[PDB]
């Protein structure tokens, strides 16, 4: 069949393009009849690796997100709400898969790694990425793999909250691109799953609570974490980590009518915007992200207390009549 030319048995072919074909990953639960507790193995997708001539990591996004715990609503788009009737998690297999949309003529580097410290900070440069134990180094166009070192320790989910994210999380996951020529798309990576659900509980809420200090930095958290809400002395920051349709509820301290800006992949849905000028205010809004960078920001003055809540929601109303 195939006739390929200029080839004598034992020779190399670098083709114009390559592609694998990906299908319906329909999960299987297994009954580990135990404490009458469950086990799940399904395939959840994870992000579209775009290029970075320069040197970027999960989107140039920072605050080890990525985090291998399930939920990571940030990471795992389906497991979201099962390990949600449960309290202890434990994997058996997790494998990074890297397919490629681009073609044998893009010019760059992608790279998947694994840090056992859910908390150490991120890759600085070339020489650092490469020193990791569990790493892989691929041109972008060519097809790649990574399998992850799983213990069987009895590890806890984030339902109550826990600052030592390391003693509870399994690992960190990296994806890193340098040496590109443009920050376009070349890769879409997947997630090979297998998890052991344990002491199943009243089901935890997935709702987000995020306080800015009055002049300050940061008050409480509950998370998960889709959002960070910073202030700058005038003006807020609502910096997305998550994608989809959300629902936003809250307001803040200002005095000064709200001007609703945002930036990147964004589909505003319902912006409602009470103020009282002199005092504080409220915002409900409903938006829908499908990118990074998605940003939004409220524009205001004298941002002297920041409060919000975020808890994923449909094309759902959020405005008066």
Q: 21 to 80, contacts with its own copies by CB under 8 A? A: 26-31, 33, 35-48, 53-55, 77-78, 80
Nearer to its own copies, 144 or 297 (CB): 144
Of the candidate spans 141-149, 197-205, 222-230, 271-279, the one that interacts with Ca ion by CB under 5 A turns out to be 197-205
Whole-angstrom distance, CA of residue 110 vs CA of residue 144 = 9
Q: Which of residues 72-101 bind Ca ion (CB under 5 A)?
A: 87
Tell me if 76 sits within 8 A of 139, measured CB to CB: no
Q: Give the DSSP letter string of 264-277.
A: ES--EEEEEEEE-S
Q: Which of residues 146-175 bind its own copies (CB under 8 A)?
A: 149, 151, 153-154, 156, 159-168
Whole-angstrom distance, CA of residue 210 vs CA of residue 217 = 11
* Near its own copies by CB under 8 A: residue from 69, 72, 239, 288: 288
* φ/ψ bin of 278: left (φ > 0), alpha (ψ from -120 to 50), beta (otherwise): left
Q: Which of residues 208-267 bind Ca ion (CB under 5 A)?
A: none
Q: Which of residues 249-268 bind its own copies (CB under 8 A)?
A: 249-253, 265
Q: Which of residues 179-238 bind its own copies (CB under 8 A)?
A: 179, 184-185, 188, 199-207, 209, 211-214, 219-220, 222
Q: Are strands 39-41 and 244-245 parallel, antiparallel or unpaired?
A: unpaired
Q: Where are the beta strands (DSSP E) in 100-184?
A: 110-113, 136-138, 144-147, 155-156, 174-178
Residue 188 CB-half CA count within 13 A: 8
45 makes contact, choosing from its own copies, Ca ion, none, with CB < 5 to 8 Å by partner type, with its own copies
Nearer to Ca ion, 106 or 115 (CB): 115
Geometric angle at alpha carbon 177, from 119 and 143, rounded to 5°: 110
If binding means CB under 8 A, how many residues of this protein chain bind its own copies?
A: 147
Of the candidate spans 32-40, 46-54, 108-116, 270-278, the one that interacts with Ca ion by CB under 5 A turns out to be 108-116
Given the rule CB under 5 A, which residues bind Ca ion? 87, 115, 117, 120, 159, 201
């Amino acid at each position: 069949i195939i006739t390929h030319v200029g080839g004598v048995g034992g020779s190399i072919m670098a083709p114009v393009a390559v592609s694998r074909q990906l299908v319906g990953s329909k999960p299987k639960f297994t009954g580990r009849t135990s404490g009458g507790v469950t086990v799940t193995s399904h395939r959840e997708y994870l992000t579209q690796v775009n290029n970075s001539s320069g040197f970027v990591v999960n989107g140039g996004i920072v605050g080890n997100s990525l985090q291998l715990n399930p939920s990571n609503g940030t990471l795992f788009s389906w497991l979201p709400a099962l390990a949600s009737n449960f309290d202890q998690y434990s994997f058996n297999s997790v494998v990074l898969d890297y397919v490629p949309l681009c073609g044998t003529t893009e010019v760059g580097r992608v790279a998947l790694y694994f840090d056992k410290d859910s908390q150490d900070p991120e890759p600085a440069d070339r020489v650092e990425l490469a020193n990791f134990g569990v790493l892989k180094e691929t041109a972008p166009w060519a097809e790649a793999m990574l399998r992850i070192p799983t213990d069987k320790v009895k590890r806890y989910c984030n339902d109550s909250a826990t600052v030592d994210q390391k003693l509870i999380d399994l690992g960190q996951l990296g994806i890193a691109t340098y040496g590109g020529a443009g920050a376009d798309a070349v890769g879409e990576l997947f997630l090979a799953r297998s998890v052991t659900l344990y002491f199943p509980q009243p089901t935890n809420t997935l709702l987000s609570s995020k306080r800015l200090d009055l002049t300050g930095s940061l008050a409480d958290a509950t998370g998960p974490g889709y959002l960070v809400l910073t202030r700058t002395p005038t003006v807020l920051t609502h910096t997305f980590r998550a994608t989809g349709t959300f629902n936003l509820s809250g307001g803040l301290r200002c005095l000064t009518s709200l001007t609703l800006g945002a930036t990147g992949a964004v589909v505003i849905n319902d912006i409602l915007a009470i103020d009282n000028v002199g005092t504080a205010s409220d915002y409900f809004l409903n938006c829908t992200v499908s990118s990074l960078p998605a940003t939004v920001t409220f524009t205001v003055s004298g941002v002297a207390a920041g409060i919000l809540l975020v808890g994923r929601a449909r094309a759902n109303v959020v405005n008066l009549l």
